[PDB]
User: Fold Lamin A/C from Homo sapiens.
Amino acid sequence: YIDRVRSLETENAGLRLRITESEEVVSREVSGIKAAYEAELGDARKTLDSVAKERARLQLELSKVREEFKELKARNTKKEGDLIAAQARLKDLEALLNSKEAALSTALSEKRTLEGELHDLRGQVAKLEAALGEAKKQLQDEMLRRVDAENRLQTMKEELDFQKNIYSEELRETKRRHETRLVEIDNGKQREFESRLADALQELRAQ
Amino acid sequence: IDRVRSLETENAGLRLRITESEEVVSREVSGIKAAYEAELGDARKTLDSVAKERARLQLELSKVREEFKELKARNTKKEGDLIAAQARLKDLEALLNSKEAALSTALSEKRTLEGELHDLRGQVAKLEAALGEAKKQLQDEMLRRVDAENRLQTMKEELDFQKNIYSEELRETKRRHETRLVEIDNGKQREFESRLADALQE
Amino acid sequence: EKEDLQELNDRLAVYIDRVRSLETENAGLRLRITESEEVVSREVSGIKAAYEAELGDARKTLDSVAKERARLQLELSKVREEFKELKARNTKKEGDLIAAQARLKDLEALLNSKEAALSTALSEKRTLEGELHDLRGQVAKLEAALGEAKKQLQDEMLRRVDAENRLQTMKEELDFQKNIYSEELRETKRRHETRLVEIDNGKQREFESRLADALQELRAQ
Amino acid sequence: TRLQEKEDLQELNDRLAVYIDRVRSLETENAGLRLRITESEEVVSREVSGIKAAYEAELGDARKTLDSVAKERARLQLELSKVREEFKELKARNTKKEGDLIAAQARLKDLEALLNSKEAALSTALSEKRTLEGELHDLRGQVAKLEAALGEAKKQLQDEMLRRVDAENRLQTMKEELDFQKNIYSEELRETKRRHETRLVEIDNGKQREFESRLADALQELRAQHEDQVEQYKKELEKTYSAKLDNARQSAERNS
Assistant:
C-alpha cells in the first residue's frame, strides 16, 4: 500500500505547478477585462465629447439668431406703427380732398352763372345801343318835319295878314272915293240943274 | 504511516488552502467588474442625457430659424407698403394744396366778375334812361307838329272867311251908296217936274 | 188986378201949348231917328248872318272834338288800369322767380356738399370691406395650416409610440441575452467541477489498474 | 181976398217959372235931336264898326279854344299809343318770365328729390359702416384664437419629436450595450475553458509521464535480461568449444 502513497507524492509534485501558475493566470484573467472595458469607456467618452462640442456650437448659433430676431422684431414694430400712422393720415387727407372739391365745384357753378348773366347784359347793351340810335334818327326826322310845319304855318299867317290889310285898305279907299264923288255931285248939281231946266223951258214955249 | 498521514494531511490542507486562496482573488476580480460596469453604466446614461439636450437645441434652432424667415417676409412686404403709403401721401398733400389754390383763384375771380356785372348794370341803366328821354322828346315833337298843322288848317279857314266878310261889306256899302245917289237923283227930278208943271200953269 | 192976371194967364196958356207942341215934335224926331237906326241894322244883317254861320260851324266841330277827348280819355284810363294789374302780376312772378333762383343756388351747394360726404362714407366703407375680406382669407389660410399641423402631430405621435415600443423590446432582448449568458457560464463551471470530481477517482484507479496490467504482462509472461 | 189975391198972383208966377224952365229944356232937347239927325250917317258907321269888332273877337276866342282842344286831344292820342305799347312790352317780358318760372320750379322739384335720395344713401352707408366694424371685430377675435391654437399644436409637435428622438438615441445606446455584453461573454467563456483545459492537460501529462516512465524502466530491464541471457549462452558455448577441442586432443594424443 506504499504505491498509493507514492501516488500522493506525485499528486503533490503536480500541485507545485498548480500553485505556481496562479500569478500569470489571474493576471491574464484581469488584462482582458481591463482592455475591453477601458476600450468601451474610452470610445464612450470620445462620442460624448463630440456631442458636447456640437451642443455648444448649437447653443451659440441659437443665441445669435435670437439676437437677430429681436433686432428685426423691433425694427418691424416701428415700421408697422409708421404704416398705421400713414394710413390714418391718408384717410384724413381723402376726406379733406372730397370736401375741398365740393367747395370748388360749388364755386365754379356759382361763377358760371355769373358769366352767363354778364354775357346776357352785354347783348342787352348792344341792342339798347342800336335801338337808341334808331330813336335818335327818328327824333331828327320828326324834328325836321315839325320845323317845316311851323314854317308853313308862319307863311300862311303872313299871307292871311296880307289879304286882311288889302281888303281893309280897299274898303277905306271905296268910302273916301264915294265922299269925294258926293262933293263933285253937289258942285255939278248947282251948276247943272238950270242948264237943263232952261233947255226944257225953251222948247216948252214952242209946241 | 508517519510519512503517509503527514503527506496526506499536508496535501489535503495544501490544495484546500491554495484553491481557496485563488478563489478570493477571483471574487476580487468580480468586484473589479462590479465597479467597471457601474462607471460604464453611468457614462452610458449621461450620453443619452446630452443626446436628448442636443436634440432639443436643434429643434429650437429650427423653430427660431423658421419664425425668423416668416418675420423677414412680413417686414419686407410691410416696408414696401410703407414706401407706397408715404409716396401717395405726398401726392395727396400736393393735390390738396393745388385744389386750395384753384378755389382761391375761383373766388377772387368771381369777385371781379361781380365788379364787371356792376359796371354793366350802370351801362344798361344809363342807356335805358337815354332811350326813354329820346322817345319822350320824339313824342313832344310829334305833338308840336300836329299842333302846327291844326293851326295851319284853322288859318286856312279864316283866309276864306274874311274873303266872304269882305264881299258882304262891299255889297252893303255899295248898296247904301247907290241908295244915297238914287235918292239925290229922285229929288232932282222931283224939283224938275215940279217947276216944269209950275211954269206950265203960265 | 184986372189986367195983369189976365195977361199972365194968357202967358201961361201960351207956355202950356208950347210945351205940348215941343214934346210932339220931339217925339216925331225921335221916331225918324229910331227908324234910321233900324233900317240900318236890317242892312248890316248880312255880315251878322255870316258871322253866326261861322260860329255855328265852329262849335259844331268843337263839340265833336270834345267828345273825342272823352272817348279816348276813358280808353286811356282803362288801359292804364290794365297796365297796373299787369305790373302787379309781373312784380309778383318776378319775385317768385328770384326766390326760385336763390333756392336753386343754395340747393346745388347742398347737393355738392352732400355728395362729398356720401363719397367719403362710401370710401371708408370700402376700406372696411377690404379689411374684412383679407381677414376672411387669413382665417382660411389658418385653417389650412391647423389641418396639416394636426396631421403632422398625429404622424409624429405614431412614430413616437413606434420608437418607444422598439425601446421596450430592446430592453427585453437585453435582459434575455444577459440571463442566457449568465446561466450558460454557471452551467459550464458546474459541468467542469462535476467532470473533475468524477476524474478524481474514476480514471485514477482504473488507469493505474491498466498500467499494472501492462507491467505484469510484460515483465514476466 | 186981398192977401189971397196976392198969393194967387205969386202962385201964378211960380207955375209960369216952372213951364218956362220946361220950354228951355225942351228947346235944348230939340236942338240936340236935330244935331243927331245929321250925324246919323256917322253914328251908324260907329255902330256897325262896333258889332263887327264884337263878333270878330268872339270868333277869335272860338278859334283859340278849338286849337287848344285839338292839341289836348292829340296829346291824349299820343299817350294812348304810348301806354298801349308799354303794355305790349310788359306782357312780352312777363310771358318770358312766366315760362322761366315754370322751368325753375321743374328743376327745383327734381333737385329736391335728388337731395333727399342722397340724404338717404348717406344713412344707409353709415349704418353699413357700423355693421362692418362689428364684423371685423369678430374676425379679429377668430384669428386671435386660431393663432393660439396653431401655436399650441406646433409646441406639441415639437415635444413629440423630441421624445421620439430621445427614444431612438437610447435605442442605439442599448444596441451598443448588447453587442458589448456579447463580446464580454465571449472572452469570459474563452478564459474559463482555457483554465479548465490547462488543468485537464495537467492531469493527462501526469498520467503520460508516469506511464512512459514505468514502462521504459520495465522494457530496459527486460532487454538487459535478454542481453545477459545471450551472453551466458555464448560463454557456455565457448566452454563446449574448448571441451570438444581438448577431447579431440586426447583422441589424437592416443598412443601407447
User: Anything to note?
Assistant: The radius of gyration of chain C is 92 Å. The CA atoms of residues 54 and 60 of chain C lie 10 Å apart.
